């Protein structure tokens, strides 16, 4: 999705095996190696495309055209911000006008506000890194019995021996 109109994918009732992600050029959690030990009420994956020099704006305490007018994250945000270069996917010669961002607004956005009430990105394959497109996914963690949890590991079953067992807890 365009950053001015970012989309939210809701993740629920499943196993969040975060090792498929952790093990991207940016992987900053607000510990990334302990994600598999946590349960959540919900996990939301907010998907959008921005410029390289705008990636730094996708964080708590940050300001700027994206942070203030397109995609705002709260100072008390809990979750992970993951991003990677998409120069060979979202760029066109002359500028890919499919992706747009808000340049002007009367006031700043609230956290996770989606205002689609607008300028195109000049995304080109020959742009400098700061002006290349990046695909950004922000995983917001909502902390119910919880429906999103990490994977369980297992061994095997050994019989006719004294063993220390754990059967589903």
């Amino acid at each position, epitope marked *: 999705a365009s950053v001015y109109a970012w989309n939210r994918k809701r993740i629920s009732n499943c196993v969040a095996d975060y090792s498929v992600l952790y093990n991207f050029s940016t992987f900053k959690c607000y510990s990334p190696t302990k994600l598999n030990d946590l349960c959540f009420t919900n996990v939301y994956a907010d998907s959008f495309v921005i410029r390289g020099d705008e990636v730094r704006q996708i964080a708590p305490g940050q300001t*700027g*055209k994206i942070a203030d007018y397109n995609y705002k994250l709260p100072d008390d945000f809990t979750g992970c911000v993951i991003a990677w270069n998409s120069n060979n996917l979202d760029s066109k010669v*002359g*500028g890919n*006008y499919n992706y747009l961002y808000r*340049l*002007f607004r009367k006031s700043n956005l609230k956290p996770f506000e989606r205002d689609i009430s607008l*300028q*195109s990105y*000049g995304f*080109q394959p020959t*742009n*400098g890194v700061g*002006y290349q497109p990046y695909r950004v996914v922000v995983l917001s963690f909502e902390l119910a019995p919880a429906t999103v949890c990490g994977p369980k590991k297992s061994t095997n079953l050994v019989k006719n021996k004294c063993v220390n067992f754990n059967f589903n807890g």
Partner: antibody, heavy 120, light 108 residues
Framework: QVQLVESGGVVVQPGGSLRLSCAAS????????MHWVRQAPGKGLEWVSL????????HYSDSVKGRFTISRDNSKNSLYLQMNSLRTEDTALYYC???????????????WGQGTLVTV | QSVLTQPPSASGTPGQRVTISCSGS????????VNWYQHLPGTAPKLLIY???QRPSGVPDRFSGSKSGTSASLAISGLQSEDEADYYC??????????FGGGTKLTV
């Protein structure tokens, strides 16, 4: 990544004419208003003219009004300035610049080209 | 030989703050907005401030301005040696078209 490239910075005899050309890329061309600004040597910036995206309106500074013509070709992503009845007073560094955004207009914004030198 | 009036120069010690004033008629500032440019010798002018107090991408919060009455000003704080540039005041006029001032030379 907005780029503007000027051409036509040549020396012309007074009483003659010269056309300047600005190539544009890195942004939507056909929806944006564009402006020309010139800087005479030893002086500050002097505004020349603007043409809107649809040709809806054109404006000239009095010193060039009636003698300069501004036009654009949205199929080539290019802006042109035709300056006739030239005087030695028109010697200046000419810059190509775009406005702040689409549709409307005011003054030249952040993206300026390097410019080219016009001598009369 | 200009409509918008500015001082010829400004100066100060790095780390300090200076201001550059701009004035004109009600048809220049009073009924319109004021933009500012920072022109570094060797290249083109770039937009610094627009619509009185807004900034374009790439311009830090050390640069700000305001408009009141029939006058306007640019404030430059945290002076750096890299800001030794000519600053310009511009506005759209009701009688004339695009109006630029003489420019103010800011030096270390």
């Amino acid at each position: 990544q907005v780029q503007l490239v000027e051409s036509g910075g040549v020396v012309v005899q007074p009483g003659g004419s010269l056309r300047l050309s600005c190539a544009a890329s890195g942004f939507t061309f056909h929806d944006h208003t564009m402006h020309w600004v010139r800087q005479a040597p030893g002086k500050g910036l002097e505004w020349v003219s603007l043409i809107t995206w649809n040709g809806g309106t054109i404006h000239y500074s009095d010193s060039v009004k009636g003698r300069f013509t501004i036009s654009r070709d949205n199929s080539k992503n290019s802006l042109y300035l035709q300056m006739n009845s030239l005087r030695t007073e028109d010697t200046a560094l000419y810059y190509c610049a775009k406005d702040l955004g689409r549709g409307g207009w005011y003054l030249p914004s952040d993206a300026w080209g390097q410019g080219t030198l016009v001598t009369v | 030989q200009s409509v918008l009036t500015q001082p010829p120069s400004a100066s100060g010690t790095p780390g300090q703050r200076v201001t550059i004033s701009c004035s004109g008629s009600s048809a220049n500032i009073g009924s319109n907005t004021v933009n500012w440019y920072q022109h570094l010798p060797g290249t083109a002018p770039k937009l610094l401030i627009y619509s009185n107090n807004q900034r374009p991408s790439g311009v830090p919060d050390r640069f700000s301005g305001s408009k009141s009455g029939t006058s306007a000003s640019l404030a430059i704080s945290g002076l750096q040696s890299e800001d030794e540039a000519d600053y310009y005041c511009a506005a759209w006029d009701d009688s004339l078209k695009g109006v630029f001032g003489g420019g103010t030379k800011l030096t270390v």
